[model samples]
Target: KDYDELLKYYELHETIGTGGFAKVKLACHILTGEMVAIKIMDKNTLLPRIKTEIEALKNLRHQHICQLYHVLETANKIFMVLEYCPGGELFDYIISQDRLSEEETRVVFRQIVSAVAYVHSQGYAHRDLKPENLLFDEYHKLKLIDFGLCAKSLAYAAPELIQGKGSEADVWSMGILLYVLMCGFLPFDDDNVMALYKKIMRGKYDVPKWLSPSSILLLQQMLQVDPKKRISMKNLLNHPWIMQDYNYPVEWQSKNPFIHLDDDCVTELSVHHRNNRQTMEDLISLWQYDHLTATYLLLLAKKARGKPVRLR
Candidate 1:
């Protein structure tokens, strides 16, 4: 309804996601020409505490966590502008690949750990950690999303939390996420809620036959029934399994993948991406959202993946 107000800065396209109280739309930022996701929620449908929890997300600035670029409001609704990620959920990736090799998993998993570590450091615990909540960007980098905004699903809920019994529970969920990545299936699952809870409470998930000793060791530590015995996030980051090849840098330490332009590339590329009179400050501020930076992103994606894919 307030698309009129939103059009002041963005042009709304099609809906990308929707739920009972909110809708996610694909929008183009008019100033930068960047594609962004606008999460729209009617004011009347929201619960009371959502705004405060949302404020917490604003403080998070990391490479793998989806960026909440701006928050806008109208007389009747709230519009949250967000980073647009083209890679679908990690859930779908695992499903399509039928699980990943340990090396591939390590590359993917380390990014998750790095992002989650940053989140935990910022005085928040992602109570829900699962493939469904994870997404990837055009560059294939992993990203964690949805913060603490929704109800928990049983399959991914930790034993302590399903039945903060705090962060350890997050470890428990990560344990499940890793297991699914390694084996392509749930370690603890049942059609009946009571039966599933029993499996989770008993900490009785099957260890696939071929996991490495280090892999086996890490899984057991993370999936412990008792929070006291569960691996702490700090120690988990350094455990043998997580440390192998450990080459990926956390978001803050990494550079934007699309910004690798050399003098030769820049002089010619900028001719088209920049305005006839755009200034030097705009180039430096590519770190911020602007026409040139966003153009660089979309242009990179165009060359990397020829066709645009949209799956809601």
Candidate 2:
């Protein structure tokens, strides 16, 4: 994983993203000219964390999950080559539309649920299931990313995260995300940290009046305070709302052996995808200030607890 080794195979371009411990750069394969995202992390500080994420990505192979092309490790850093998602973050898309129609939300949620179901089946739970981690492909299909915080959370975290059994937290987060997509706001919101935590701990959130009864039922079942009572992934798939025109692929329904789907690879770009790229760049710049404010609030809550606290 020397700098020369990576430079020999891929032409590294401008950095597309930066986080607390890593930076993502856009790269192109020298041999095939295929676009990819290379996330470089400092090994000195984040070795164990990045290793866990790499292992999780290795285990996951799903259409709606971000594809991990390969991993390279050096004495000083770790590099992960991932599929480049052109359609940007699901958060940006949701906000741009204000609120989505039932049909549109249905399509988005279906793919999201499909990804979550697969992750759970593999015995791993994505504790951070917010819209920011959900990306879209060139075709507008959802692709879940960022397993670094798989067993961690900030907001939209389930009570189980504190109980040490976070396996069911994914479902609960999905419920919150669905609420946001339909209503354009968090189901539970408060300026006070304790107030927000209290509301979420009790699973107390008002459903929008416009939501259909079936949708409301689905939300209630997923957002249950008791993880044991929350709807299982199987039941979720069987629900009336999810079952309608639900031909999307799930682990149990597929009989074919696991093979890399060729369509998932990015070999070329189109005008629409290029436009998507530009939009994402613009959104990132505009969102930086707001995102920083939210992060500060989360840090305040963590400090009050004296450490990283999960819900119970």
Candidate 3:
């Protein structure tokens, strides 16, 4: 009936997070002793947005998606019981750990894409798909959250969102996400909003040299200026790179046998292989190098060639 009434059944503790007009709290179910996240929002300000969020969550169910438990209404506010993600926000995790390896990034991205695909299938679009909205469980499995801004959030908004295009907006946001995961920075970001908007409008961004050939291609396809040309969810799910094993498959690993090479040998062999090898093998060689050595070689190779080092 009221805030106090709800609290009688659930013990509310510390505030965990806050947004524009909402705050999330850690709460425990009195009877079951189960913990959950309680997102409390100003009802007057969020009526329409909250309705959409609840509707979308109600119709969707997937492992990578956050689960909504119940909605409790108060005179001044609304509370949404949500799955408590013990591992915290993806942004905090990435920053604390200094970004993830390609293998780990692949795992996270695959789960995100799977969840997004499911959302789209349910006739909803997660317009805001940045790392801050992604959470993880104790086992590190991803759980996509914060659908309140599903058709908003200017920074991650798609070009076609202004025209009210549906699912394609999510494809554009996922491209931004992939870029951030691989490069540890936003491709079209700037302090100036107009400049950022212009860059996104023109689809102007460089594919980083370290990205595998297939990854670069997928990014290019998904980040198209025209929504019609952006890769569809079906194609994205079926893409070879997205579906490929994070670690090189056993056969490919055995055939390459490239992991044990020393720095000098790597420098020497790269010359002969850079132009002659297939993209897959190029990716294999690059992936085999540890992060520091990979950075060294990427910069060194760029200096040697005076251009973008070709992985494709």
Candidate 2 TM-score versus the reference: 0.77
Every model's TM-score: 0.77, 0.77, 0.74
lDDT score of model 3? 0.70
Question: Which number leads on lDDT?
Answer: 1
Cα lDDT computed for each candidate against the true fold? 0.71, 0.70, 0.70
Q: Which stretches of candidate 1 lie over 4 Å from their true place?
A: 19-21, 149-152, 247-312
Please give, for residues 135-251, the per-residue lDDT of candidate 3 as tens digits: 987568788888875542566778877445468878888888888788887878788988888888888787767888887888899888798889988777767787677433111
Candidate 1 lDDT (Cα, 0 to 1): 0.71
Ranking by lDDT: 1, 2, 3
Q: How well is each residue in 13-132 modelled by candidate 1, as lDDT tens digits?
A: 999776555688899877545688878888886573447546655566677888666666778887777778889889999999998888898888888888777777767777778997
Error of 3 at 63 (Å): 1.0
Q: Write the per-residue lDDT of candidate 2 for residues 45-119, one digit (tens) a residue.
A: 744778678778767767788867657676777788777887888988988999887778888988888888878
For all predictions, the C-alpha RMSD in Å is: 6.4, 14.8, 20.3
Best by TM-score: 1
Q: Flag clash pairs in model 1.
A: none
